[PDB]
Amino acid sequence: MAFRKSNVYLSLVNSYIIDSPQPSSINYWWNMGSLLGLCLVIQIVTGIFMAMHYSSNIELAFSSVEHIMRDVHNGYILRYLHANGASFFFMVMFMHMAKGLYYGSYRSPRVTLWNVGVIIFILTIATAFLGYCCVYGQMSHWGATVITNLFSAIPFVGNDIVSWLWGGFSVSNPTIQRFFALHYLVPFIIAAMVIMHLMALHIHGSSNPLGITGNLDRIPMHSYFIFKDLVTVFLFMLILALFVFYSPNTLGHPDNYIPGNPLVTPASIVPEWYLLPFYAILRSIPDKLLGVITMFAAILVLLVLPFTDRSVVRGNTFKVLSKFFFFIFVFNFVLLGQIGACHVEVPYVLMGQIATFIYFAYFLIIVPVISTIENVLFYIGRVNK
Amino acid sequence: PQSFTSIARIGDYILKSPVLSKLCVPVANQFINLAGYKKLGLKFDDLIAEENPIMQTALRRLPEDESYARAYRIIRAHQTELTHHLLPRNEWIKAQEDVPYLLPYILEAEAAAKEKDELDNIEVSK
Amino acid sequence: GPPSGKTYMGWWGHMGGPKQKGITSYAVSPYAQKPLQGIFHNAVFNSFRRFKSQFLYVLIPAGIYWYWWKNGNEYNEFLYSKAGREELERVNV
Amino acid sequence: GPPSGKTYMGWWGHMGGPKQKGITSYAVSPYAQKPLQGIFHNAVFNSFRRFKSQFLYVLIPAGIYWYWWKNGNEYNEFLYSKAGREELERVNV
Amino acid sequence: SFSSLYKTFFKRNAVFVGTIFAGAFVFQTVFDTAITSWYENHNKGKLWKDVKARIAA
Amino acid sequence: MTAAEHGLHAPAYAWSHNGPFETFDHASIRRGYQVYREVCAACHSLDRVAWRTLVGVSHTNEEVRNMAEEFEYDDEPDEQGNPKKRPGKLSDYIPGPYPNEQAARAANQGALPPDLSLIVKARHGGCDYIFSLLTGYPDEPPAGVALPPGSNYNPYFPGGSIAMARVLFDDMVEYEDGTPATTSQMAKDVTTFLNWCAEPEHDERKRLGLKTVIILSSLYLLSIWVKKFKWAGIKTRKFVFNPPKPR
Amino acid sequence: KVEVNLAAIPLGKNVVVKWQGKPVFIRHRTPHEIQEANSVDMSALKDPQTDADRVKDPQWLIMLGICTHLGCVPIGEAGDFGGWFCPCHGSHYDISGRIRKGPAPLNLEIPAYEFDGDKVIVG
């Protein structure tokens, strides 16, 4: 046999990359997983090369990030690459999750794959939060203050958990150094979780946009999907190069270039844009305990979706009502993000509460009823009786 | 996840009622025409996800000519959607051609598995 | 090594599909083909077919949610203006 | 999955050793045994057997290098003393 | 003479990869020179060389 | 919130550097450093800009050295351990007017003037915001504005009441090149200089961006060709189906 | 827990410090301000508390500088009530620091503090 099959490690690279049998009919939405791996390699490399210059003290965090932006050779390249690549990481992650929600990639074989994906989603949200708080701008300090003061709503040990996370009595020097140690650590937990994602993917193979079995027509991944993924790799690099070199501060809030002042509230405390729908699901509930419970349930309601998708065909490729309500869910998510960017004002509170209810009624109410109705319509449209 | 016996029960109730038939059957016919699986050469029982032991049982119990024809329709739909086209209009599956061929095998394997579970969980009346 | 559980995918030779008979595949060498064949016909015609097939599902929720967000934004700009402060204090208190 | 190369270890059932006939194993339950049986006999007798068989290989080279190190240390301490400065400048220059 | 063209450049992969690397070297030098020339010529009047010539005159 | 609490949004001025192939007007940077030193240096600081970054942008080496020698910083203490002052050099930073925040608030009616190093990137609107904020001080505030003592009116400031007085009047700085320093000309020059202090990498960043966009777009189109080339053999496949004999 | 000496703070002045990342001020109140603080009916109060419940020393008013609407800083000795004025959304508090008019739901929070003669330990 070949050396790519007989070796210990090259058999792994072969059975994952070179001979991995993909179905022939998958499209460019299946490129987002390889794109997320590319985003992770970009984030980890630019993160190490800025951690060689960053200082995590509360007097030197913002000054060291500005030292990267001014004194370090091509350090502006590394900083804008890290920041806008985190925004692109979350763009491609939302596309990966939405194509999973659409094409039914969460169903019966791949429930382990979907759940490990949700764990990666939680860890990546946490990494982005800690790294945003590492800059120690104005949005960093106050975002840290709000999101870690959320945990003082737990009635038993809320103050204990809060003063353990802070390392003191407010967000300060031990908080920022804690967050830097954790922001270095947690992406390697993400890399191990990506290897577990690849295991759960490899035991059953990819899905295809038809939803039907893909065992009949398959293609080895090398020389077909390598270049088919190279197309989107260069396209992702092109859009990221545009957003790094020509509009580098479009996806950033301009208040982060104010140094972190604990005595000044910046009149709109808002996190990064990819956490804004969860910030809106937070602020919709008029209680601090039920709000953070609803935000964690907003991340964790995707675990209910394998057992509520009552359909008998996989994926909304051939389902009219499921397609319509899937894009209603997608634009509800965009509305939720734009709502959470807004202030807490009169039409926005009711619109955010209604959009949160539609977000939770998609998985819990809309999907079982619509899929049952489509099962009945699919039966009686072709059974003659 | 929804059992095929339940879909058959609800659909037979809709079809046996004269009001529900004339109200919901054209909605389902237009739903199937909008669903567009016939433009790829698929009948509907090619679309059922087979990765469960009831469907593996029914596909094992399918006769061989239906198995070879289903294999060709699945491979043809994969190649058609690879090329990002549809089949030509004489290669579309006609309405009278879209017969449930896997459905008696699915319903029989479902009744066998439900009877096996019910006998696994009996309580003898003593 | 140890064997693992029953999966719905094998490897090259024992994929676990049906037995296939009578299905005959023909392909040509790409070196004897024209790549970028039909791209100007598909770019204006097949792309139009795909857009005609799949734009109501993507555009009617976009229309609903954008009209909702625009109407809410216009109501907010009416509320925090000078002409609607009576309604502002009424709907705030 | 794909097969790996020819290895010299199988798993439980197909290890890759030869065929065995006639070798018969006997093993009684530890719950019927005495753990800590013989630890005092083997503490002073079996341990002396193992040490007696295997201490020349460990004690001749250790003694060689320790005598070499002690001799070098004493020569250095003599050299950087007052009695051996003539030999110090001689072997240093 | 596509046979001689292929036999010189694309038959041996060592000659192919060496040709690609030689072209990458030449393209790096030539491309950076042409981009800096086009950029500085597009922004004529705003550079420090032009401001320095104005202060000297 | 209200329009007065948001502040008036600053219109898009045709800046010389807006646009993907554009560079800072470095003569405008030199004029902006003149209007920083002669006006804005009495209340605002530039604690992130070293003297050595101005060499090759708005001044020369022997031209920056004279300003750095005009300021005085702390030295290493002498042999007796006494504090000692030193005429500054190219490695030192542009000094602020006040020793600390308490002295700044004492000098400026209780309000701290921010350090102007990153404020083009620290405010929404950016350069347009700085320009409209400097120029659009109304001589009279509009009728009914309850104004605090010592607070001036500016519409583009969020809240309407800014603690910075209008500081840019006509011909208060004699330019070196004879450029007629009106109010809006000096405001445009300091906005360009503060934008350079915010983004000193701007010119080289757009240059490497041009290189990168051309290289990556060419790689994208080349990769589309190579992908369709490799996929021709599968995309042009033909399946035929003669049904088998029943046995 | 910090200690602030009450000797260099004269009558009729404020002193604003930071403590655990939060602003906290001390006021040497006049007897006019003490009578004005105990001379407001609780019906005028959306969050009604008394001066004996809100300070331990009536001479020395000590409270946190967090406006209870969203966390802005009320300006020192500004407003229409003789107290403090949050300028972010127009919140007013008296010299006792209770909310009368504004979007603030509660009064200015009192920290925990004890006395050592002419100095205070807040913590």
Ligand SMILES: CCCCCCCCCCCCCCCC(=O)OC[C@H](COP(=O)([O-])OCC[N+](C)(C)C)OC(=O)CCCCCCCCCCCCCCC
């Ligand atoms: C927590 C989970 C969140 C999850 C949600 C996160 C946000 C959403 C992420 C991005 C949207 C991802 C959509 C992925 C779904 C998809 O792949 O669409 C495919 C569809 C139809 O394709 P098909 O169903 O495979 O059919 C092809 C075969 N036929 C039958 C035609 C022969 O093709 C279409 O109908 C066109 C769809 C193209 C989608 C483009 C994006 C549209 C939405 C953009 C929203 C953001 C833009 C505004 C931002 C301000």
Ligand code: HEC
């Ligand atoms: C003297 C005192 C001056 C002079 C000569 C200038 N500024 Fe300005 N400035 C000053 C104070 C006390 C404040 C604080 C006001 C407040 O807190 O609102 C400011 C403020 C600014 C700002 C920030 C505005 C904002 O936060 O939205 C910018 C930007 C600013 N100042 C710029 C600026 C420029 C470009 C000048 C050029 C000559 C300038 N100031 C002069 C005090 C003073």
Ligand code: HEM
């Ligand atoms: C999982 C991938 C990662 C994500 C999603 C991520 C996300 C982020 C984000 C959003 C920021 C703020 C950027 C800004 O606005 O300026 C940031 C900052 C930072 N990250 Fe990461 N990061 C990742 C990996 C890493 C790793 C592995 C390291 C360390 C080796 C690292 C080091 C840094 C540092 C030093 C900063 C400080 C501010 C800066 O220079 O940008 N990052 N991170």
Ligand code: HEM
């Ligand atoms: C660091 C982040 C991630 C990486 C690197 C990653 C990587 C991959 C890769 C390479 C694939 C195979 C290619 C593909 O099908 O697209 C894949 C498949 C999949 N991933 Fe992810 N993934 C990540 C995050 C997630 C998330 C957040 C989810 C959603 C919960 C998820 C769910 C899935 C699913 C369901 C599949 C199977 C899709 C299918 O085959 O139909 N992954 N992932």
Ligand code: FES
């Ligand atoms: S924050 Fe004090 S008034 Fe709203």
